[PDB]
Structures are given as structure tokens and as C-alpha cells.
Design an enzyme around this catalytic site. Structure first.
Site, mmCIF file in Angstrom:
data_model
loop_
_atom_site.group_PDB
_atom_site.id
_atom_site.type_symbol
_atom_site.label_atom_id
_atom_site.label_comp_id
_atom_site.label_asym_id
_atom_site.label_seq_id
_atom_site.Cartn_x
_atom_site.Cartn_y
_atom_site.Cartn_z
ATOM 1 C CG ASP A 179 0.407 -3.388 3.235
ATOM 2 O OD1 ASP A 179 0.650 -3.278 2.017
ATOM 3 O OD2 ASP A 179 0.133 -2.411 3.961
ATOM 4 C CB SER A 181 3.816 1.332 5.540
ATOM 5 O OG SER A 181 2.720 1.489 6.426
ATOM 6 N N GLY A 182 6.672 -0.450 5.532
ATOM 7 C CA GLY A 182 7.786 -0.989 4.785
ATOM 8 C C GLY A 182 9.149 -0.746 5.399
ATOM 9 C CG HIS A 227 -0.379 0.569 2.447
ATOM 10 N ND1 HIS A 227 0.318 -0.199 3.353
ATOM 11 C CD2 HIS A 227 -0.398 1.825 2.952
ATOM 12 C CE1 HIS A 227 0.709 0.561 4.360
ATOM 13 N NE2 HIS A 227 0.289 1.794 4.140
#
Ligand SMILES: [Ca+2]
Ligand SMILES: [Ca+2]
Ligand SMILES: [Ca+2]
Ligand SMILES: [Ca+2]
Ligand SMILES: [Ca+2]
Lengths: 377, 50
Positions: A229, A326-327, A183
Site C-alpha cells: 500500500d 494512511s500515508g 488506497h
């Protein structure tokens, strides 16, 4: 024994201590120390224990009042040094530095990318010049975060949109392919990669920018429940490994679930928001938090928590990563080397009491990650 | 025979215990160390007149 005049002189180890009861004291003035008196005395109540030669394979014999104590060679256990100790992955990692195996009642060590095993049979070989997993009162919203030291966070990968504002943190896999959240790609149809970013506004000249070539993301991802994700993006220009750009060691699917994530602590890093409704962070940040059990993980979140979700952080200490992380690289310092563990997707707020930051399991995606290189490599 | 010392305007003594115990201490056992000979110790104004 201990008669009069007698003990008005000095003891003799034949005169008194043998034909006599030799209680002690007179057994101790002959040496006046601690080196020989104990051992010597131990053999007159019931005899010497090293007469029988109880220990095995040159195991040191220590006498005592009714027992013998063995101090064997390397790798020997048991009552009489008769047990030849087995080295296991649980028993001291099989002496392997990074990768252990339990092969046929023994341990045969392997290593990860850029690592081989030396003739010692246990220690690896950091073939790569810079092997992965090595370190190559202020107010205003510093949530326990630490500025990375020079080269301390070299796997830090960043995703930059069109308008020159990098958003998502990441772990530098290699020169060509870069992992990211699935995402994180939803932010734009176009964005690039810049690695080595530590301070966007003040430039030292030590940043490398590589264009994103092909999107390799997750198929069954859920945009509401945040299931699965993860994504992979390719770099147009190879990363020449140097002090500010070093890879992160990829563990194995089983190994990171048996030893790596069973350790207490980990490290969380990223370039997201410092706090809810907060601002972006420019200085390269890192954090220190431990891993907690699953039985308190289900009660934390308001989503559906499945086998792909684990909890890391504190219920009390308020230092939690936020949106935009995120990530980001979520690594654990193993015996001597870092290995990635988690990938951020979301969080039920940021720094809420009793809550945890959500990271996707890297080892549950490592077989996914390794599939990414042998299809379009 | 303990010398006296003026504290708060009043004379007080100074004698002070000195507990003691076996030396076999040096062989096995532990807090089992018990006491076995209290010597009291003080201070005089010794003279040798003749
Ligand atoms: Ca003697
Ligand atoms: Ca004799
Ligand atoms: Ca004698
Ligand atoms: Ca005698
Ligand atoms: Ca004696």
C-alpha cells in the site's frame, strides 16, 4: 619505621621512607593530601610502572600497586595503547551525522539530498536553507497525542477531497511529487493537495495548496490483504521551502534497515481518527511511541504478516492511530536529523490490547521512491 | 556525670555514641571500612571552685 619520639615530629622522605619499611602514614604526612602520596608509594613494593614506558603514542601513564593504567590520545584502545581503533558504522556511526559507510576497513561519510560532506570528513552540510529533519486535564479523546509546535512537523502533507475535507496525512518529499498511500486514492477519482494545514477552520495564511497532477501508485497492491500500500502524487505548484513547509530526509535502502529502524523509538503523526468510531481531528497532531520486536508482531494481527510489515506502539499504553492516517509521516529522530520510516495503511481496530499500528517500511520502498523521480521527473 | 532531662515527667539521659575509624581510609579498598574506636560522648555541669 614507626618508632617512638621519632614520630613525635614530622616525616622526611629520605630519612624514613626509603631506608625504612615506609608502611604508609609516615609516607603521607610529608605531603598531607592525595595528589602525590598514592603514585609515590606505588613504586616501593615492586617499583615504578612508568619506568618501562608501556603505553604507546603518548598514552598517559598512571602507576599503581601492580598495574599501569593508560589514558591514550583520541581514537586509541588496547592494553598498551598499541591498538589503533577503527571507526565503524556500528562504532559511533563512523562519526557521520546522518549517512555512514563502511568502506575498506574505514568510514567514508556521505549525505542525503541537500547535504554534502565538509572537510572534517564526518559532518554533513545542510545546503538547503531549511534542511530536512529539523524542527523549523483535557478530556474529549486526546489519545496521548501532541499538537505539533510551530514548524515541528513541516513535512506534514495532506490530501483534500472535493468537499474541502482533508483526510490522509503524508510526508512532504519535495516541491513537485508527494507520497501517499495507494488506497488513499481509492477515496475519490479526484482530489487535491494542501500542505501546511494545521487548523482548517482558523486560518493564519500559512497554507499552500498544490493540485495533484499524475497518479504514481503501486501495481501489485491488494485491496483485502493490504499488501504493498503506497502511492505517489505530483504537485502542480512547487513548494517554496519555508518554516511551515520543510522536506523530510530520505534515507537509503540499506542504511535505514541497519541503523535507523534498529533504534528504540519513533514518532507517529497524522490527521486520521483519534479513536474507533470517533471524529476527525483539526489541530495538527503528533504522537510518541517506541518500536518493538518482530517476534511479538506475528501474534498481533489477523492478516498474513510478511516481510513488508512491522509493529510499532504499545500493548499497554492506549494511544494508537486510526483510519484516515494512511500515508501519514512516521519518522524517527536520528542522531541529529529526521528520516522517514513508516507509511500507514490499516489497523486491526484502533487501540486494542496486544495490537500494533501497521506501517509500511519506507526503506523497503525508498528504492521504489527514488525510482519515482528519474522516470517522469 | 551525664546531665539529666525531664521527658514525660521522668528523668532520662542524653549520652550518644560517636563511631569512628581509620583515616588510612584515604587509600584503596571500600566497604571494607570497619570500625575501630567508639568514643562515648556526653555532657557535664563543670565547675572550677578554687
Ligand atoms: Ca611524620
Ligand atoms: Ca638516602
Ligand atoms: Ca624519622
Ligand atoms: Ca630510622
Ligand atoms: Ca612520619
Amino acid at each position: 619505621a614507626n618508632s617512638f619520639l621519632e614520630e613525635m615530629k614530622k616525616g622526611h622522605l629520605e630519612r624514613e621512607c626509603m631506608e625504612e619499611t615506609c608502611s604508609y602514614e609516615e609516607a603521607r604526612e610529608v605531603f598531607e593530601d592525595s595528589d602525590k602520596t598514592n603514585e609515590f608509594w606505588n613504586k616501593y613494593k615492586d617499583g615504578d610502572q612508568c619506568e618501562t614506558s608501556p603505553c604507546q603514542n603518548q598514552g598517559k601513564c598512571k602507576d599503581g600497586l601492580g598495574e599501569y593504567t593508560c589514558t591514550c590520545l583520541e581514537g586509541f584502545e588496547g592494553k598498551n595503547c598499541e591498538l589503533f581503533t577503527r571507526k565503524l558504522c556500528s562504532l559511533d556511526n563512523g562519526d557521520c551525522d546522518q549517512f555512514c559507510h563502511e568502506e575498506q576497513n574505514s568510514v567514508v561519510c556521505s549525505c542525503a539530498r541537500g547535504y554534502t560532506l565538509a572537510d572534517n570528513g564526518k559532518a554533513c552540510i545542510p545546503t538547503g536553507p531549511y534542511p530536512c529533519g529539523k524542527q523549523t486535564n483535557n478530556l474529549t479523546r486526546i489519545v496521548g497525542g501532541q499538537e505539533c509546535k510551530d514548524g515541528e512537523c513541516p513535512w506534514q502533507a495532506l490530501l483534500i477531497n472535493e468537499e474541502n475535507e482533508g483526510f490522509c496525512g503524508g510526508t512532504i518529499l519535495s516541491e513537485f511529487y508527494i507520497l501517499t498511500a495507494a488506497h488513499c486514492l481509492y477515496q475519490a477519482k479526484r482530489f487535491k493537495v494542501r500542505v501546511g494545514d494545521r487548523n482548517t477552520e482558523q486560518e493564519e495564511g500559512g497554507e499552500a495548496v498544490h493540485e495533484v497532477e499524475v497518479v504514481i501508485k503501486h501495481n501489485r497492491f491488494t485491496k483485502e490483504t493490504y499488501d504493498f500500500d503506497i502511492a505517489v502524487l505530483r504537485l502542480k505548484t512547487p513548494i517554496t521551502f519555508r518554516m511551515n513547509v520543510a522536506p523530510a530526509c530520505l534515507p537509503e535502502r540499506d542504511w535505514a534497515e541497519s541503523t535507523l529502524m534498529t533504534q528504540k523509538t519513533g514518532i507517529v503523526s497524522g490527521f486520521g481518527r483519534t479513536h474507533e468510531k470517533g471524529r476527525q481531528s483539526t489541530r495538527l497532531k503528533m504522537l510518541e511511541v517506541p518500536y518493538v520486536d518482530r517476534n511479538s508482531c506475528k501474534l498481533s494481527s489477523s492478516f498474513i504478516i510478511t516481510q513488508n510489515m512491522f509493529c510499532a506502539g504499545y500493548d499497554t499504553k492506549q494511544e494508537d492511530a486510526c483510519q484516515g492516517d494512511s500515508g501519514g509521516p512516521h519518522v524517527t529522530r536520528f542522531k541529529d536529523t529526521y528520516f522517514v520510516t513508516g507509511i500507514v495503511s490499516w489497523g486491526e481496530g484502533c487501540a486494542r490490547k496486544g495490537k500494533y499500528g501497521i506501517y509500511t517500511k519506507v526503506t523497503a520502498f525508498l528504492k521504489w521512491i527514488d525510482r519515482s523521480m528519474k522516470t517522469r521527473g | 556525670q551525664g546531665v539529666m532531662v525531664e521527658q514525660n515527667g521522668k528523668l532520662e539521659s542524653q549520652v550518644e555514641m560517636q563511631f569512628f575509624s581509620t583515616s588510612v581510609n584515604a587509600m584503596n579498598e571500600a566497604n571494607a571500612i570497619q570500625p575501630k574506636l567508639l568514643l562515648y560522648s556526653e555532657d557535664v555541669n563543670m565547675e572550677t571552685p578554687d
